[PDB]
């Protein structure tokens, strides 16, 4: 889906499979968190479906020894003295000592400030213990979390429930057309993108000789040239657009191991899983009712949440009993207008926009004469069209697909291309759609705050700030204090300060809230980028102080108050909203759960040959399953005819379904339901 999803997949630890355990034999004890998983397997990142606990992600600093156990690094404390010597301990090796938590107050020499410090002991015991007892201590605070988990800013303010969803949904982000790095970061976004392998890093130091949208050439110091080719508009495994773009320009000195070009979900080398959106935390006329989301149409007009998707379509020409399937533009009983987008071979031409039902590859298969309907042989005689022994088996666009044809690949047995035995030609057509953000597309943040788009208001309808800038997204307030994910509120505050910038009062010394902050944080410019590392990062004392010194806009006015709220105007009436509303910038991701894929409907269509019931799934153009539980609802209502109707004429009644379709197009009444063919099979199976 995105680089993070790929990097996480390689670091997965799966209990299932051969030699492990069966899913039906995995009890509630294998799946839950064990105290030996600290710094080895993440306690947060795991699916919430039937594979919960059975699939984990390796912790960040963790590694595997040649035996098979997972080691995690620690700083060896000799006698209450922190040393820079680091040693990796296995799981059982860790229990034979006691280790101090990473956030221990430590002297500049290395001595612990308190005699009693929070220390982990064997069997998952936490207690204070003398400073002369600490054998090791954690490397980093975030030592226990996974890479994806470590990307959630203010993670220590979100409950584990929504934190799990936060990391799991980051892997579901969709690569947008253009990508922006988040204002509020954790620092992990850089290494996560580089180590994932979807960017282009310089192997050796040198200068940029030539740069194009196609490739980047680097002239090394010794004299050799290495050229990196960009992956442009390539279909990913899950239909997302993997597209790399050069970053450097002509004649730029680039160091070794530096990002010279970045791919999907990357901006200047950092994980850009979404966009920075101006968010207001308020209910709005019920359009954001329990977890629904309201969006400004600006995100549509400016392609802010627009993403490219590519589908692969395929068909082949085989040898049949009565001849050979041939791919040809000549298709029986088709106008020159539908075939107008096809070349002389029967293939759609590059660049042609194709809706659903349009022909992509024109293939005809010879059908025998003894396979003809009585009406079809009469209909063939009353049209005088002889020599049409072939029928239409062309490759058409599925329902719900549409886009520009971007590439064609043809494989022919005639041209040394190795096809499976019995095939004479193979064609693959790549179709790319440009998907703007739509009503019902699923957005989400980094704190497990998910929701579908409930309404995309015009830019004027949106509640706007004092200087006319409308907000981009309206998140409901009711869905905040239940989930225990205040991190989105804290990110919104720090997000605004990043958008505006700040200046702390330097006169009369450094204030008492900014004493712990680094000197680099005392002054910030608008649209500055910041890191809130997991279990470290911004404290509420410093965040409260930043809102008090936010930089004014171009007009010189401070829009947000020290509380973090601002005064909004109802764009639909004009009256200002009666109370200040929390307003800031939040990083929102477009998840790969779009209505363009998830909408489906069927009047009639294919039926499973054996049971004579409609097929399943959208891809097979199937119908919905009125299951066992759903039939109890009908009977509870007493809706007898609806129940009989569902299970007969609308399902597996071979003659009833055809006579109902005729009764509708005739305007007649619905006929009487017959006997299900599935019940006929049951009897023939009992026999």
């Amino acid at each position: 889906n995105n680089p993070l999803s790929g990097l996480t997949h390689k670091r997965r630890l799966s209990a299932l499979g051969p030699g492990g355990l069966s899913r039906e034999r995995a009890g509630l004890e294998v799946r839950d968190v064990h105290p030996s998983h600290y710094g080895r397997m993440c306690p947060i990142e795991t699916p919430e479906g039937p594979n919960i606990g059975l699939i984990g992600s390796l912790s960040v600093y963790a590694r595997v020894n040649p035996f098979g156990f997972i080691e995690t690094p620690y700083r060896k404390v000799v006698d209450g003295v922190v040393s820079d010597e680091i040693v990796y301990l296995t799981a059982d090796e860790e229990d034979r000592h006691v280790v101090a938590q990473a956030n221990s107050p430590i002297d500049a020499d290395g001595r612990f400030v308190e005699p009693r410090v929070l220390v982990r002991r064997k069997a998952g015991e936490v207690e204070y213990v003398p400073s002369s007892e600490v054998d090791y201590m954690d490397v980093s605070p975030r030592q226990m979390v996974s890479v994806a988990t470590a990307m959630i800013p203010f993670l220590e303010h979100d409950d584990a429930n929504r934190a799990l969803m936060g990391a799991n949904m980051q892997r579901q982000a969709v690569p947008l057309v253009r990508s922006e790095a988040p204002l509020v970061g954790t620092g992990m976004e850089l290494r996560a993108a580089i180590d994932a392998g979807d960017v282009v890093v310089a192997e050796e130091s040198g200068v940029i000789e030539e740069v194009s949208a196609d490739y980047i050439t680097v002239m090394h110091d010794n004299g050799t040239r290495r050229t990196y080719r960009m992956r442009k508009f390539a279909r990913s495994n899950h239909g997302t657009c993997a597209n790399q773009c050069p970053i450097v320009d002509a004649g730029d000195r680039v160091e070794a191991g530096q990002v010279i070009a970045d791919g999907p979900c990357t901006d200047d080398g950092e994980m850009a899983l979404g966009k920075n959106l101006l968010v207001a935390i308020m209910p709005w006329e019920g359009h954001n009712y329990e977890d629904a989301i309201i969006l400004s149409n600006r995100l549509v007009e400016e392609d802010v949440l627009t993403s490219i998707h590519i589908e692969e379509h395929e068909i082949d020409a085989r040898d049949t009993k009565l001849g050979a399937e041939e791919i040809t533009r000549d298709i029986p009983n088709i106008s020159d207008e539908v075939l107008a987008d096809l070349d002389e071979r029967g293939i759609v031409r590059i660049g042609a926009e194709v809706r659903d039902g349009d022909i992509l590859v024109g293939k005809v298969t010879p059908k025998g004469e003894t396979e003809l309907t009585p009406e079809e042989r009469l209909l063939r005689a009353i049209f005088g069209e002889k020599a049409r022994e072939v029928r239409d088996t062309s490759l058409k666009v599925p329902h719900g697909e549409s886009g520009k044809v971007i590439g064609i690949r043809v494989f022919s047995r005639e041209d040394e291309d190795e096809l499976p035995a019995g095939v004479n030609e193979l064609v693959r057509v790549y179709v790319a759609q440009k998907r703007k953000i739509s009503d019902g597309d699923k957005l989400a943040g980094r704190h497990g705050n998910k929701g579908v788009i409930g309404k995309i208001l015009p830019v004027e309808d949106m509640p706007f700030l004092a200087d006319g800038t409308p907000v981009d997204i309206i998140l409901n307030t009711h869905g905040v204090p239940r989930r225990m994910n205040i991190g989105q509120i804290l990110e919104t505050h720090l997000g605004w300060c990043a958008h505006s910038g700040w200046k702390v009062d330097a006169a009369k010394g450094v204030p008492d809230w900014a004493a712990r902050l680094p000197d680099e944080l005392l002054e910030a410019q608008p649209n500055a980028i910041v890191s809130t590392p997991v279990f470290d990062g911004a404290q509420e004392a410093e965040l409260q102080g930043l809102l008090s010194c936010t930089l004014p806009n171009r007009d010189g006015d401070v829009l947000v108050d020290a509380d973090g709220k601002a005064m909004l105007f109802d764009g639909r009436s004009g009256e200002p909203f009666p109370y200040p509303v929390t307003v800031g910038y939040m990083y929102i991701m477009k998840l790969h759960h779009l209505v363009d894929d998830k909408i489906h409907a069927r009047s009639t269509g294919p039926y499973s040959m054996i049971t004579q019931q409609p097929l399943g799934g959208k891809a097979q153009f199937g119908g919905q399953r009125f299951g066992e539980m759903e039939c109890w609802a009908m009977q509870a209502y007493g809706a007898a005819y609806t129940l009989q109707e569902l299970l007969t004429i609308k399902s597996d009644d071979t003659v009833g379904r055809v006579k109902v379709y005729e009764a509708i197009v005739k305007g007649e009444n619905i006929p009487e339901p017959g006997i299900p063919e599935s019940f006929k099979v049951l009897l023939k199976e009992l026999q």
Partner: peptide, 23 residues
């Protein structure tokens, strides 16, 4: 500064604790 090792953009971190070992 955060991750001053590859030549990346300068993201400013609210870090009170030094990182002894890099990822």
């Amino acid at each position: 500064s955060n991750n001053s090792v590859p030549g990346a953009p300068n993201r400013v971190s609210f870090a009170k604790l030094r990182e002894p070992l890099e990822v």
